Amino acid sequence: HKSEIAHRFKDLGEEHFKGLVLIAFSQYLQQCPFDEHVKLVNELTEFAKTCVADESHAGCEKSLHTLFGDELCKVASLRETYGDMADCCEKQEPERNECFLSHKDDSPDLPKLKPDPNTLCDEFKADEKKFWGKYLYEIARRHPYFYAPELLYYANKYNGVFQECCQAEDKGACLLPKIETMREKVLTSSARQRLRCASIQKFGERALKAWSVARLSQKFPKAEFVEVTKLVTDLTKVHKECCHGDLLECADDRADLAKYICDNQDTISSKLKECCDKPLLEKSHCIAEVEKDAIPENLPPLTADFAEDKDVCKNYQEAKDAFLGSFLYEYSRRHPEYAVSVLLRLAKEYEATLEECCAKDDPHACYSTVFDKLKHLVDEPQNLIKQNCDQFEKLGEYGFQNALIVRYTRKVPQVSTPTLVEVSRSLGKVGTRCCTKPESERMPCTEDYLSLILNRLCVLHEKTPVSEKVTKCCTESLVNRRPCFSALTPDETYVPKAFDEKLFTFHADICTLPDTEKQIKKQTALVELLKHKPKATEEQLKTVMENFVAFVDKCCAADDKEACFAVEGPKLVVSTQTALA
């Protein structure tokens, strides 16, 4: 293929090709209408055909970055709509693309899609392929780093829901639990992916390679260290690809990996037959979430290769990363039950122990007892879960969430009120995800989800920074991010924010609000309280929360919504300044 774009079309087929390109446009230019995007997609798609006929046509030898980028620069409303993004056009590739990426909005502030059974069913029966595409649109433009192939898979599943439910009688009661389930999976899938993109973009491939080794050695402990390095290499490239935005190349390599993995399951995992039956995209999804394989029986103890062994310092100096990779693998395959995040912590620690012990007099005497500083980092996470699950069960979801709001607002009062609300809400849902799960399954479940959610915090923060505490924690480590935040305590350095009455005014429009957006208004007010009076003991906040509730309820159900929020509102406000010294 003297022509990359031709290659892609051949390799992917029109349907997906057309999808991935719409995703890309939707991800770079996030506030453009669906229509205007569809347009560009066909333009690029027609041309793609030109090149598959004539690999030698003018332009075909151009990179997919050049090509796609040139198209972006032709959008006429682009400076108007996107600002300093228009300036990226003045630049050569690959600086141009890099500039485009950096203008991707991680918090895009677009209407929260509140789905109507009846109307959505109409669009489906009408245009199934436009409906599918508009899904692709609306997700991708809200998740500009969403793993492109996986979002294809999700559009599929979304179609499978609507194709089935619009024929049931009570369409709504059929589909609405289904769209709700998926939604969580999609946000999880988004979160996971943005953490992959932040690994590479902020800590190098090295970082994301290790994230991999770990996870894969757990999935396929029956695989050689050779195999796993091949497998990793491949999957990192896919992820490097989807992150820098060459989505077609991404979707390709990923499918090539799926093909390879099934073409080799004999030297990877017994758990693969079920996956290696499916259609293209279903297959890859199933491989991702495969059952782990039984750990091989008679493996030596670790303590033999990496502590008892004589020439460990030596091997470590010979192939720094290989040796360390080796560790990560041997340790990862043995212990499926550890969280990935923990396993990697063990790895950096091991690295630290060797790096200190090697430049010493009697290096063996020093490193012999590494598995000692090592056990010490499997217990640290273990006690802080105990508390959380003790607290979740004793407070319920929304209640635990509010406790977290308080802890976080104290920890880093600096951070944007909107961020603290969204973050604390997600740390909350972790209770309901994990504490339910079997006592010993607990710590890994929580370690993974916190990994994502904390990254979300770092991602919103890095953009427009405020807390050196947040930044220090976000940048100093990737693995030790979670401990780093637990460590933080409130700042006597924090001068309390002044009283602003608009932060604690409640209009009769609090009863219009849905349950979710109702708690948010409430939770926001909690933050703005803790921000104004940071010293206030939960003693007081207790009756303050009981008080908003004494009031929201007394008016939202009063004879005249407003005459209440009118007079009874200011009452509450004078109240709480008398309440909080």
* Tokens of residue 498, six digits: 């002044």
Q: Is 256 labelled as part of a ligand binding site?
A: yes
CB-based contacts of 153, cutoff 8 Å, min separation 6: 281, 282, 284, 285
In the complex with Au ion, which residue's Cβ is closer, 31 or 475? 31
Write down the least CB distance from residue 31 to Au ion, Å. Answer: 6
* CA 168 remoteness from chain centre: 34
Q: Is 150 labelled as part of a ligand binding site?
A: no
User: What is the rounded CA–CA span in Å between residue 195 and residue 202?
Assistant: 10
Residue found by looking up tokens 């802080």 in the block? 384
Q: Is 127 labelled as part of a ligand binding site?
A: no
In the complex with Au ion, which residue's Cβ is closer, 26 or 424? 26
Taking each continuous run of H as one helix and of E as one strand, the counts in the chain are 25, 0
Q: Is 249 labelled as part of a ligand binding site?
A: yes
In the complex with Mg ion, which residue's Cβ is closer, 253 or 330? 253
The single-letter DSSP state of residue 504 is G
* Tokens of residue 152, six digits: 């294809």
Cα dihedral 363, 365, 370, 373 in deg (nearest 10):
-110
Does a cis peptide bond (omega within 30 degrees of 0) precede residue 94?
A: yes
Distances in whole angstroms, Cα of residue 416 to Cα of each of 159, 409, 465, 467, 483: 37, 10, 9, 9, 22
Number of shown-chain residues binding Mg ion (CB under 5 A): 1
Q: Is 461 labelled as part of a ligand binding site?
A: no
Among Mg ion, Au ion, none, the one that 77 touches (CB under a kind-dependent 5 to 8 A) is Au ion
The single-letter DSSP state of residue 496 is P
Among Mg ion, Au ion, none, the one that 246 touches (CB under a kind-dependent 5 to 8 A) is Mg ion
CB-based contacts of 503, cutoff 8 Å, min separation 6: 524, 525, 528, 532
Residue type for 26, please? Answer: S
Asked if residue 494 lies in contact with residue 420, where contact means CB atoms within 8 angstroms, the answer is no
Contact string (CB under 5 A) for Mg ion, positions 245-284, x = contact: -x--------------------------------------
Q: Scanning residues 192 to 251, which ones bind Mg ion (CB under 5 A)?
A: 246
In the complex with Mg ion, which residue's Cβ is closer, 246 or 253? 246
Q: Is 241 labelled as part of a ligand binding site?
A: yes
Q: Scanning residues 25 to 44, which ones bind Au ion (CB under 5 A)?
A: 32
Task: State the distance between the two ends of the chain, measured CA to CA, in whole angstroms.
Answer: 74
Chain residue whose CB lies nearest Au ion: 32
Element at 570 (helix H, strand E): helix 561-579
Write down the least CB distance from residue 76 to Au ion, Å. Answer: 8
The total number of residues written for the chain in this structure: 581
Asked if residue 293 lies in contact with residue 269, where contact means CB atoms within 8 angstroms, the answer is yes
In the complex with Mg ion, which residue's Cβ is closer, 71 or 246? 246
In the complex with Au ion, which residue's Cβ is closer, 31 or 382? 31
Among Au ion, Mg ion, none, the one that 81 touches (CB under a kind-dependent 5 to 8 A) is Au ion
In the complex with Au ion, which residue's Cβ is closer, 74 or 463? 74
Number of shown-chain residues binding Au ion (CB under 5 A): 3
Residue 85 in the binding site for Au ion (CB under 5 A)? no
* Tokens of residue 435, six digits: 């504490």
Write down the least CB distance from residue 239 to Mg ion, Å. Answer: 15
CB-based contacts of 223, cutoff 8 Å, min separation 6: 216, 217, 231, 267, 268, 269, 333
Q: Is 103 labelled as part of a ligand binding site?
A: no
Neighbours of 416 (CB within 10 A): 17
Cα dihedral 9, 14, 20, 22 in deg (nearest 10):
120
Residue 477 in the binding site for Au ion (CB under 5 A)? no
In the complex with Au ion, which residue's Cβ is closer, 141 or 482? 141
Among Mg ion, Au ion, none, the one that 264 touches (CB under a kind-dependent 5 to 8 A) is none
* CA 456 remoteness from chain centre: 7
Write down the least CB distance from residue 69 to Mg ion, Å. Answer: 11
Write down the least CB distance from residue 77 to Au ion, Å. Answer: 4
In the complex with Au ion, which residue's Cβ is closer, 38 or 520? 38
Write down the least CB distance from residue 98 to Mg ion, Å. Answer: 13
Q: Is 65 labelled as part of a ligand binding site?
A: yes
Q: Is 54 labelled as part of a ligand binding site?
A: no
Residue 528 in the binding site for Mg ion (CB under 5 A)? no
Q: Is 239 labelled as part of a ligand binding site?
A: no
Q: Of the candidates 42, 77, 167, 516, which one interacts with Au ion according to CB under 5 A?
A: 77
| Residue ranges in contact with Au ion by CB under 5 A | 32, 77, 81
> What is the binding site for Mg ion (CB under 5 A)?
246
| Annotated binding-site members for Cu cation | 1
Which residues make up each annotated binding site? 1, 4, 11, 65, 241, 244, 246, 249, 252, 256
Annotated binding site for Ca(2+): 4, 11, 241, 246, 249, 252, 256
